[PDB]
Amino acid sequence: GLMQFTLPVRLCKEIELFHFDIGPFENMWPGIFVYMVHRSCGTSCFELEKLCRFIMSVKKNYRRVPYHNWKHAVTVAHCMYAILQNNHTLFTDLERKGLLIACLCHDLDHRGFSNSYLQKFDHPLAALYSTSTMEQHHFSQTVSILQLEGHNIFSTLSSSEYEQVLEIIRKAIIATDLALYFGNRKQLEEMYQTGSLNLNNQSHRDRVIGLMMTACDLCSVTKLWPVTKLTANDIYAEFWAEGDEMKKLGIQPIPMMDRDKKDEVPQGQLGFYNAVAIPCYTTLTQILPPTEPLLKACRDNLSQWEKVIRGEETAT
């Protein structure tokens, strides 16, 4: 275990920032992920050769879609790294291990379509899994990959530790279904405001980890403006392809998925920062005060979208 992963000077500094962008060199992202695992977990959490084989099989089962791709997996994992490193006294050995892996695996085999498009299309995944359809598919892909030869990165855990870390990963992946976020955040807001929240309660921990997953999964809204604006182009590239598919079934798409409604994107973003993102990072900051820079960069990008609405800025 005398093989440390090292990063160039600028990446070693800036990867500690919540707003870090992992860059356009795909062949560096496995190295970045391993480095974050060695520092947040430890060099002996996993055998390097199995982790590397795992990472490359995971990469292989992400698709060449505009947004829900391999670069999103690593980006979401980096946001979990920042949260873990700035809160290191609060999490267990098994939570460190499981959570970066859950983030890497959390959108495995995404085709760029929502749970609603699978219901309206009558995709077979919708018969198998009636709610959190894609998310139950992503967990199931995670299990397939763990069961490939030489891919059990959790080989040294007991039977009952292996079962807990898989349950951490299952719950974390299910939580990235944004339809569940609204309930989970309501519950955590009441629990914090009445002072009933208890990190020794497993059902409370599950809720906090879920919100952590929502925060990590939306983290595009918490990058510097040019990253935030450029990533919104890839998100809408997918939404509009899905709305096209909705039209082919003879169904009117909701406005965010209609490419004809392109000029209303700035007002849509504002709707989404006020109804989803700001509440998300506000609640997470109350629970984990050191996650502050996420909410701060969210508020900053809200102003940016407001400048776009008043013509002081453009977005093509």
Ligand X SMILES: Cn1ncc(C(N)=O)c1C(=O)Nc1ccc2[nH]c(-c3cccc(Cl)c3)nc2c1
Task: For the chain, give the residues followed by a break (C–N over 2.5 Å).
Answer: none
State yes or no: residue 177 binds Zn ion (CB under 5 A). no
Report the C-alpha gap between 58 and 51 in whole angstroms.
10
State yes or no: residue 232 binds ligand X (CB under 6 A). yes
Alpha helix segments (H runs only) across 90-177: 93-104, 115-121, 124-128, 133-146, 159-175
Report the C-alpha gap between 117 and 251 in whole angstroms.
10
Of residues 103 through 122, those in contact with Mg ion by CB under 5 A are: 107
Is the separation of the CB atoms in 151 and 47 below 8 Å? no
Under DSSP, the state recorded for 110 is -
Residue from the set 176, 222, 283, 285 that interacts with Mg ion by CB under 5 A: 176
Q: Would you say 178 or 237 has its CB closer to ligand X?
A: 178
Out of ligand X, Mg ion, Zn ion, none, what residue 227 binds, judged by CB under 5 to 8 A for its kind, is none
State yes or no: residue 215 binds ligand X (CB under 6 A). no
State yes or no: residue 265 binds ligand X (CB under 6 A). yes
Instruction: List the structure tokens of 42.
Output: 């430890």
Out of Zn ion, ligand X, Mg ion, none, what residue 261 binds, judged by CB under 5 to 8 A for its kind, is ligand X
Q: How far is the CB of 174 from ligand X (least distance, A)?
A: 15
Q: Would you say 10 or 64 has its CB closer to Zn ion?
A: 64
Which residues, 6 or more positions from 200, have their beta carbon under 8 angstroms from its beta carbon? none
68 assigned binding-site residue:
yes
Q: Which residue has the tokens 């498009």?
A: 117
Q: Would you say 134 or 218 has its CB closer to ligand X?
A: 218
Residue from the set 95, 135, 177, 217 that interacts with Zn ion by CB under 5 A: 217
300 assigned binding-site residue:
no
The count of residues interacting with Mg ion (CB under 5 A) is 2
Q: Which of 19, 68, 110, 138 is catalytic?
A: 68
State yes or no: residue 304 binds Mg ion (CB under 5 A). no
Residues 69/71/77/80 CA torsion (nearest 10 deg): -100
Q: How far is the CB of 77 from ligand X (least distance, A)?
A: 16
Nearest to 105 by CA among 156, 149, 154, 44: 154
In three-state secondary structure terms, 20 is coil
> Is 68 in the active site?
yes
Which region, left, alpha or beta, applies to residue 250 given φ > 0 means left and ψ of -120 to 50 means alpha?
A: left
Q: Would you say 93 or 244 has its CB closer to ligand X?
A: 244
Out of Mg ion, Zn ion, ligand X, none, what residue 265 binds, judged by CB under 5 to 8 A for its kind, is ligand X
Is the separation of the CB atoms in 95 and 168 below 8 Å? yes
Instruction: List the structure tokens of 175.
Output: 């939580």
- Binding-site residue ranges: 68, 72, 106-107, 217, 269
- Return binding residues for 3',5'-cyclic AMP: 68, 269
* Interface contacts to Zn ion, rule CB under 5 A: 107, 217
Residue ranges for the known binding site for 3',5'-cyclic GMP are 68, 269
Catalytic residues: 68
| List of residues contacting Mg ion (CB under 5 A) | 107, 176
